[PDB]
């Protein structure tokens, strides 16, 4: 969080090729819309990051004050799915997006992925040293175990929005 009690949240969104299967991308967008348009509260600082082989910053941290702010972020939800998969590119970039303004300790990630990635241990340390809180939504049924181990090691929640 920010020193005065404002939330810091960075959406981290799996646009990789496996996400074109079934309705994963639709379920990604639906939860991204819900979190953006209804859930996250006034005053919060919110960034957005998509990722395939690598990360693409859809937005730096902007503060939620108007419905404009919500619609802007929501319009940047991934359109289609393509490319390689590297969850760590996104978390690394999330931590960079945050640390342009605030420390990662106490901040929150919202990792929307199907979990089909087996290099996740690659960033365990940095994920630990960040102090961030990685909530995860599993959008497929074949999520790697290190996806769960990301929330477990950071204090974040896990929910499963597949079928
Ligand atoms: Ca607090
Ligand atoms: Ca994938």
From TrEMBL:
<protein>
    <recommendedName>
        <fullName>Calcium-activated chloride channel regulator 1</fullName>
    </recommendedName>
</protein>
<comment type="similarity">
    <text>Belongs to the CLCR family.</text>
</comment>
<feature type="domain" description="VWFA">
    <location>
        <begin position="8"/>
        <end position="163"/>
    </location>
</feature>
């Amino acid at each position: 969080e920010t020193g005065i009690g404002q939330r810091i949240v960075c959406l981290v969104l799996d646009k990789s090729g496996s996400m074109a299967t079934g309705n994963r991308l639709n379920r990604l967008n639906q939860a991204g819309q819900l979190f953006l348009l209804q859930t996250v509260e006034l005053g919060s600082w919110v960034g957005m990051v998509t990722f395939d082989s690598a990360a693409h910053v859809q937005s730096e941290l902007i503060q939620i004050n108007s419905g404009s702010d919500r619609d802007t972020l929501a319009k940047r939800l991934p359109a289609a799915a393509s490319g390689g998969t590297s969850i760590c590119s996104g978390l690394r970039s999330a931590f960079t997006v945050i640390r342009k303004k605030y420390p990662t300790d106490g901040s929150e990630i919202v990792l929307l992925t199907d979990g089909e990635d087996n290099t996740i241990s690659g960033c365990f340390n940095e994920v630990k040293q960040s102090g961030a809180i990685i909530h995860t939504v599993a959008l497929g049924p074949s999520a790697a175990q290190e996806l769960e181990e990301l929330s477990k090691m950071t204090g974040g929640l896990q929910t499963y929005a597949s079928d």
